[PDB]
Amino acid sequence: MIIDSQSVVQYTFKIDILEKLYKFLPNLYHSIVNELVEELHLENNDFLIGTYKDLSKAGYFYVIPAPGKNIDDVLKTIMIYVHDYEIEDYFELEHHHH
Amino acid sequence: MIIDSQSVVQYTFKIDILEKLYKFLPNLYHSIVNELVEELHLENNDFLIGTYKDLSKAGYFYVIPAPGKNIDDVLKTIMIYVHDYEIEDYFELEHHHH
């Protein structure tokens, strides 16, 4: 059974480029964020990550590192996966939307 | 970047039959607990689980459910995997050790 409990930290990590993608191509944003979260979970066993329900927090992720896992290492891993989508590419065509 | 943080709960779940296995067949215990943790992580994406470094806590696991995940559901899942090892079997032969 459960015999004890203690507080652990849950971080809110803002990923600027994803928040901006959401503002411009929300549907693409949804696709990328869900593959991102799935792949991070499939390839990493030492942290939890997820989106928030509030759309005002689109682009923000909750992050919970396992005991003994360095939060800053988790962020580096998340960003490596994020950079791989080369989201910068999309903003180059945003002007067609004016 | 990190823009906020909050406290989340980390539970200590004692698994009696594993604690008892550790007391009698520590090496088997080590093998089972490490496959258990690996399989729970591979097949479940909504909670973190792990052993503690203190051997006095052998048989106890830290458990951190993702936001919105019901801790009691996590325990049921853990026990399903634990029961599958049929650890009761081992204690039947413990008397040969007297």
From Swiss-Prot, chains A, B:
The organism's place on the tree of life at top rank: Viruses
Record key words, sorted: Endonuclease, Host-virus interaction, Hydrolase, Inhibition of host innate immune response by virus, Nuclease, Restriction-modification system evasion by virus, Viral immunoevasion
Function: Pays a role in the inhibition of the host restriction-modification system. Strongly inhibits the host mcrA endonuclease that cleaves 5-methyl and 5-hydroxymethylcytosines at the specific DNA sequence C(me)CGG.
Gene3D superfamilies: 3.30.70.2770
GO terms (BP aspect): symbiont-mediated evasion of host restriction-modification system; symbiont-mediated suppression of host innate immune response
Pfam hit, one: DM_Arn
MF annotations from Gene Ontology: endonuclease activity
Protein name per the record: Anti-restriction endonuclease
